[PDB]
Design a protein around this ligand. Structure first.
Ligand SMILES: [Mg+2]
Ligand SMILES: [Mg+2]
Ligand SMILES: [Mg+2]
Ligand SMILES: [Mg+2]
Ligand SMILES: [Mg+2]
Ligand SMILES: [Mg+2]
Ligand SMILES: [Mg+2]
Ligand SMILES: [Mg+2]
Ligand SMILES: [Mg+2]
Ligand SMILES: [Mg+2]
Ligand SMILES: [Zn+2]
Lengths: 176, 5, 142, 209, 38
RNA sequence: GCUGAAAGCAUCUAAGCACGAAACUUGCCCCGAGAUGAGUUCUCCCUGACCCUUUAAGGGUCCUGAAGGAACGUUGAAGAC
RNA sequence: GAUGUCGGCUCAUCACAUCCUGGGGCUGAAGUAGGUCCCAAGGGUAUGGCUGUUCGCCAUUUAAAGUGGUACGCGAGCUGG
RNA sequence: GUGAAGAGGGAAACAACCCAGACCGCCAGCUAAGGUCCCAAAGUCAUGGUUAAGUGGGAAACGAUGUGGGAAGGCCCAGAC
């Protein structure tokens, strides 16, 4: 339970409220909230958030670490919005952003339109790359997966939607 | 009357 | 002398209201069946319905232990070949929540004309309110 | 969406400039008067009950006469109900004409099919007839086997057998509206519809869309 | 994915994980190595 | 698949989320309150005398016979009856 | 002191160890088309020549012409090769 | 040994298994096998543990950081994993 033991610091500019099990985080980048489970105990007796297992719960230690991990990113989100970068590889693969909607061309016979979550923002510096910014790590990762799901990188040529840092193991086609 | 030989 | 036997037209019957919120299905059902059959009365008679009227509220808020909130399957046959139907506990709650209580109690009550008569005294509601205020039921903490 | 109750006048052919012949069923849809409106607070569902046509007052029963008098409407052939959508609203005594379908391209027509009486399995279920020769003995169009010996030891429910055919409610879906003639209270729908000439007919906008 | 009773690691990169009561092997080095018990 | 600990990493899962098939529950069509748990809504009709004792959801005479139904007759693209 | 055969005909019904259609993982998967495995039983799942034949071979089709249980389903239903 | 030639209670139903040998009557009591939440007579009994699989309420070789307990060993605040 090393992760659980490590405390979470709340620097200036971040306001945190604890009301029973629901813990709220506020900051410049937005507002976040989640409902922690009963097996995890969280305290705000000092400038850092402390975590521990509630008595009587077998899974307290294992699940306590999860609460610390989410809130560590939750604080990071309100102070620095998580960023996800995707790259489009293809002969004529292009992407466009109309605001809360992303328009992509991926060789299909119909247009592709994706609706972003209310808490997510997207930018398209280049037609072959789309950059997503958001406050909560969960949704931004899910949104990136959804866009990647439209056309996963092909093993033989790597064309498709991929994360910026993704590594694609290209395989050579069967000879002859 | 049937038969079964 | 002759052992006492309850008489159907002399039995005294009273009404009760039970809140099913948070109660386990099986363990609540046994108490209802015990009360419905009249096993709690000192004048209990096997061949006479000496039970009481029970009103069940919040029938959709009953709990089930373990994973059987999704693995508990209710089977019934339509009478036509291939007419075997299944409905998990969650689906039953969504569609007709008061079936789960009635089915559980029905399987614990006696079988036959008397058993069916006992079941008629059970009145299950999905909501928190009932229209039997005229019967002024007494709160029963099962 | 609301529909209207009409009468099956018969079948007719409609020619077109291009040279196509369109078989159309002529349906007479007179003024449909609203006799009662169903409200959620009182009835638990939203619907309108309408009556069409007229019937001799001598044969109108007292309870039936009293109901029509409530809505200030003349007694019709019968009474039919139509469910109301979210935006639809009507008032007792209002008259609805065939113009409702002026903007409708497809309709749903329901009615009682022609009664064939007691029909055999060959006619009722398209059962294959057995050999008419080659030794066949009194089994030219009998149903044949109806079970599988001891294991089931019974006949399953729903087994296809001879019995009443027709004379039952039938609905035909997605019939094109060839023409709507309000000045004569007529509605021409492509194709045939259930029931014989003069039978009661119910027309609704195509639910299948 | 190959379904068989005997599920074992096949190279240094294979890892045995439990997801829904089923023992399955996930390999980041080669897709052929991914297995499920069934 | 996302996030994520147990297990400082990794991990689709243990807490919590997302997608996913002609299967499943609906959607479409027909029967359907004997659904004895026998339901709901709208109209229509009946507003008299008495008598007896085993004095009670009691029996009986006289007056009354409504809404409606049935029967009969002419019949149906309804039907073995 | 009797439970009537093989095959055909008629009419079927269930299982899923799936033939087609549907959804997936690998592929020595470029594409097209396949191989293998997993989920899936809702629907669908040839006509003829020879032979008493089931089967099988052959001809020509089909998205496919699935494998089995049901007294090797079904003669108080037919046939009797 | 039992059945045959043996009833009664138990094993849901179940001659041969378990308990136990019916002279008759009783609306008395204690027990065997087996049981005690409801159908259905008796513990929703008292303690200390295990299981999360409805395992218990069917099945092997074999496979797996499931989980509890026990005795050892390598490494480690000279900084391990
Ligand atoms: Mg003859
Ligand atoms: Mg003949
Ligand atoms: Mg026979
Ligand atoms: Mg039987
Ligand atoms: Mg005999
Ligand atoms: Mg379906
Ligand atoms: Mg052939
Ligand atoms: Mg046979
Ligand atoms: Mg011969
Ligand atoms: Mg003998
Ligand atoms: Zn590997």
């Amino acid at each position: 339970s090393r992760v659980a033991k490590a405390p979470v610091v709340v620097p200036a500019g971040v306001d945190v409220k604890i009301n029973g099990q629901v813990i709220t985080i506020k900051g410049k980048n937005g507002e976040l909230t989640r409902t922690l489970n009963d097996a995890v105990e969280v305290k705000h007796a000092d400038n850092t958030l402390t975590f521990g297992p509630r008595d009587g719960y077998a899974d307290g230690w294992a699940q306590a670490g999860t609460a610390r991990a989410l809130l560590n990113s939750m604080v990071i989100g309100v102070t620095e919005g998580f960023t996800k970068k995707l790259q489009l590889v293809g002969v004529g693969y292009r992407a466009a952003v109309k605001g809360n909607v992303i328009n992509l061309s991926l060789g299909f016979s119909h247009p592709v339109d994706h609706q972003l979550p209310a808490g997510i923002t997207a930018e398209c510096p280049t037609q072959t790359e789309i950059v997503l910014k958001g406050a909560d790590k969960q949704v931004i990762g899910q949104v990136a997966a959804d866009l990647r799901a439209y056309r996963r990188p092909e093993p033989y040529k790597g064309k498709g939607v991929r994360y910026a840092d993704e590594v694609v193991r290209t395989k050579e086609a069967k000879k002859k | 009357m049937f038969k079964a030989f | 002398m002759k052992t006492f036997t309850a008489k159907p037209e002399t039995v005294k019957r009273d009404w009760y209201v039970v809140d099913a919120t948070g109660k386990t299905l099986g363990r609540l059902a046994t108490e209802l069946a015990r009360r419905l059959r009249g096993k709690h009365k000192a004048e209990y008679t096997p061949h006479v319905d000496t039970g009481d009227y029970i009103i069940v509220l919040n029938a959709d808020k009953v709990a089930v232990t373990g994973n059987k909130r999704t693995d508990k399957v209710y089977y019934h046959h339509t009478g036509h070949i291939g007419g075997i139907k299944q409905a998990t506990f969650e689906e039953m709650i969504a569609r007709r929540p008061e079936r789960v209580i009635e089915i559980a109690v029905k399987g614990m009550l006696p079988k036959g004309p008397l058993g069916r008569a006992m079941f008629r005294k059970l009145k299950v509601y999905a909501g928190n309110e009932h229209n039997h205020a005229a019967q002024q039921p007494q709160v029963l903490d099962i | 969406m609301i529909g209207l109750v009409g009468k099956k006048v018969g079948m007719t052919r409609i020619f077109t400039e291009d040279g196509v012949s369109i078989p159309v069923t002529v349906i007479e849809v007179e003024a449909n008067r609203v006799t009662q409106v169903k409200d959620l607070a009182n009835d638990g569902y939203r619907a309108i009950q309408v009556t069409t046509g007229a019937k001799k007052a001598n044969r109108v029963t007292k309870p039936e006469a009293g109901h029509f008098a409530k809505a200030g409407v003349e007694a019709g052939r019968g009474l039919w109900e139509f469910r109301l959508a979210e935006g639809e609203e009507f008032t007792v005594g209002q008259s609805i004409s065939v113009e409702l379908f002026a903007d409708v391209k497809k309709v749903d027509v329901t009615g009682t099919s022609k009664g064939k009486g007691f029909a055999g399995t060959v006619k009722r279920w398209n059962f294959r007839t057995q050999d008419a020769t080659h030794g066949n003995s009194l089994s030219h169009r009998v149903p044949g086997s109806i079970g599988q010996n001891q294991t089931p030891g019974k006949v399953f429910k729903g087994k296809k057998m001879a019995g009443q055919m027709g004379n039952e409610r039938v609905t035909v879906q997605s019939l094109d509206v060839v023409r709507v003639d309000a000045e004569r209270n007529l509605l021409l729908v492509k194709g045939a519809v259930p029931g014989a000439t003069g039978s009661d007919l119910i027309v609704k906008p195509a639910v299948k869309a | 994915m190959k379904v068989r009773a005997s599920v074992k690691k096949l190279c240094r990169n294979c890892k045995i994980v439990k997801r829904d009561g089923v023992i399955r092997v996930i390999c980041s080095a080669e897709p052929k190595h991914k297995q499920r018990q069934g």
